[PDB]
Structure 1
Amino acid sequence: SSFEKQQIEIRKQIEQLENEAVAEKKWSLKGEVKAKDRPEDALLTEELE
Protein backbone atom coordinates (compact mmCIF):
# COMPACT_ATOMS: atom_id res chain seq x y z
CA SER A 1 0.00 0.00 0.00
CA SER A 2 0.99 3.63 -0.44
CA PHE A 3 0.74 4.07 3.33
CA GLU A 4 3.15 1.15 3.71
CA LYS A 5 5.61 2.81 1.32
CA GLN A 6 5.39 5.97 3.40
CA GLN A 7 6.14 3.81 6.43
CA ILE A 8 9.34 2.42 4.89
CA GLU A 9 10.46 5.94 3.94
CA ILE A 10 9.72 7.19 7.46
CA ARG A 11 11.50 4.26 9.11
CA LYS A 12 14.58 4.88 6.98
CA GLN A 13 14.52 8.51 8.10
CA ILE A 14 14.07 7.51 11.77
CA GLU A 15 17.07 5.20 11.54
CA GLN A 16 19.11 8.04 10.05
CA LEU A 17 18.01 10.52 12.72
CA GLU A 18 18.61 8.05 15.56
CA ASN A 19 22.13 7.44 14.26
CA GLU A 20 22.72 11.19 13.98
CA ALA A 21 21.47 11.78 17.53
CA VAL A 22 23.80 9.09 18.87
CA ALA A 23 26.76 10.34 16.83
CA GLU A 24 29.26 12.65 18.51
CA LYS A 25 28.56 16.26 17.64
CA LYS A 26 30.53 18.19 15.05
CA TRP A 27 33.39 20.35 16.30
CA SER A 28 31.37 23.54 15.81
CA LEU A 29 28.77 22.26 18.30
CA LYS A 30 31.29 21.31 21.02
CA GLY A 31 31.43 24.79 22.55
CA GLU A 32 35.13 25.33 23.17
CA VAL A 33 37.27 24.17 20.25
CA LYS A 34 41.04 24.38 19.90
CA ALA A 35 43.02 24.17 16.67
CA LYS A 36 43.98 20.56 17.35
CA ASP A 37 40.43 19.27 17.85
CA ARG A 38 39.05 20.63 14.58
CA PRO A 39 40.43 20.04 11.07
CA GLU A 40 43.21 22.38 10.05
CA ASP A 41 41.79 25.47 8.33
CA ALA A 42 38.25 24.29 9.11
CA LEU A 43 37.29 27.91 9.81
CA LEU A 44 38.40 28.89 6.31
CA THR A 45 35.38 27.25 4.65
CA GLU A 46 32.90 28.14 7.38
CA GLU A 47 31.22 31.51 7.89
CA LEU A 48 31.61 32.68 11.50
CA GLU A 49 30.68 35.98 13.13
Structure 2
Amino acid sequence: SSFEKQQIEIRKQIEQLENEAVAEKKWSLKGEVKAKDRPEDALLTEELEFDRTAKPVPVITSEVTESLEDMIRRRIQDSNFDDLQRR
Protein backbone atom coordinates (compact mmCIF):
# COMPACT_ATOMS: atom_id res chain seq x y z
CA SER A 1 0.00 0.00 0.00
CA SER A 2 0.99 3.63 -0.49
CA PHE A 3 1.50 4.34 3.21
CA GLU A 4 4.09 1.58 3.69
CA LYS A 5 5.72 2.66 0.43
CA GLN A 6 6.34 6.05 2.06
CA GLN A 7 7.57 4.18 5.15
CA ILE A 8 10.22 2.44 3.04
CA GLU A 9 11.29 5.83 1.67
CA ILE A 10 11.38 7.27 5.20
CA ARG A 11 13.37 4.24 6.36
CA LYS A 12 15.87 4.84 3.54
CA GLN A 13 16.26 8.49 4.56
CA ILE A 14 16.64 7.35 8.17
CA GLU A 15 19.56 5.04 7.36
CA GLN A 16 21.34 7.77 5.40
CA LEU A 17 20.98 10.31 8.22
CA GLU A 18 21.91 7.45 10.56
CA ASN A 19 25.29 7.08 8.86
CA GLU A 20 25.96 10.82 8.56
CA ALA A 21 25.32 11.44 12.27
CA VAL A 22 28.11 8.97 13.11
CA ALA A 23 30.37 9.71 10.12
CA GLU A 24 33.43 11.90 10.61
CA LYS A 25 32.71 15.61 10.33
CA LYS A 26 33.98 17.68 7.42
CA TRP A 27 36.98 19.93 8.00
CA SER A 28 34.71 22.96 7.70
CA LEU A 29 32.53 21.60 10.53
CA LYS A 30 35.37 20.40 12.82
CA GLY A 31 36.02 23.93 14.09
CA GLU A 32 39.77 23.90 14.65
CA VAL A 33 41.50 22.91 11.41
CA LYS A 34 45.10 22.69 10.21
CA ALA A 35 46.41 22.75 6.66
CA LYS A 36 47.16 19.03 6.94
CA ASP A 37 43.65 18.15 8.17
CA ARG A 38 41.74 19.80 5.32
CA PRO A 39 42.51 19.30 1.62
CA GLU A 40 45.31 21.51 0.41
CA ASP A 41 44.06 24.76 -1.17
CA ALA A 42 40.53 23.99 0.04
CA LEU A 43 40.17 27.56 1.30
CA LEU A 44 40.48 28.76 -2.30
CA THR A 45 37.35 26.75 -3.09
CA GLU A 46 35.37 27.99 -0.10
CA GLU A 47 34.32 31.61 0.41
CA LEU A 48 35.42 32.69 3.89
CA GLU A 49 34.80 36.08 5.51
CA PHE A 50 37.59 37.55 7.64
CA ASP A 51 38.36 40.88 9.28
CA ARG A 52 41.13 43.24 8.17
CA THR A 53 43.24 44.99 10.79
CA ALA A 54 44.16 48.25 9.02
CA LYS A 55 42.64 50.71 6.59
CA PRO A 56 43.06 49.59 2.95
CA VAL A 57 45.30 51.78 0.83
CA PRO A 58 43.02 53.79 -1.51
CA VAL A 59 42.68 53.33 -5.26
CA ILE A 60 42.88 56.50 -7.37
CA THR A 61 40.09 55.74 -9.80
CA SER A 62 38.92 58.41 -12.23
CA GLU A 63 35.92 59.51 -10.15
CA VAL A 64 38.33 60.29 -7.32
CA THR A 65 40.47 62.18 -9.85
CA GLU A 66 37.62 64.39 -11.09
CA SER A 67 36.52 65.06 -7.51
CA LEU A 68 40.00 66.15 -6.41
CA GLU A 69 40.63 68.42 -9.40
CA ASP A 70 37.19 70.00 -8.93
CA MET A 71 38.18 71.15 -5.44
CA ILE A 72 41.50 72.47 -6.75
CA ARG A 73 39.67 74.53 -9.38
CA ARG A 74 37.17 75.95 -6.88
CA ARG A 75 39.99 77.01 -4.56
CA ILE A 76 41.75 78.93 -7.34
CA GLN A 77 38.47 80.32 -8.68
CA ASP A 78 37.97 81.92 -5.25
CA SER A 79 41.73 82.47 -4.74
CA ASN A 80 41.28 80.67 -1.40
CA PHE A 81 44.96 79.77 -0.96
CA ASP A 82 46.48 78.47 2.28
CA ASP A 83 50.06 79.60 1.66
CA LEU A 84 52.58 81.32 3.90
CA GLN A 85 53.00 85.11 3.84
CA ARG A 86 55.66 87.50 5.08
CA ARG A 87 55.21 88.74 8.65
- Structure 1-normalised TM-score? 0.90
Which structure is higher in RCO with an 8 Å CA cutoff and minimum separation 6? 1
Identity %: 98
Aligned length: 48
Structure 1, residues 6-37: CA drift from partner, whole Å, max 9, x if none?
00000000000010000010001111101010
- CA distance in 1 between partners of 2:30 and 2:19 (Å): 18
Asked which structure has the greater CA Rg, the reply is 2
Gaps of 5+ in 2: 48-86
Give distance in 2, aligned partners of 1:46 and 1:12: 30
Question: Which structure shows the bigger proportion of residues in helix conformation?
Answer: 1
Moved over 4 A (4+): none
RMSD: 8.2
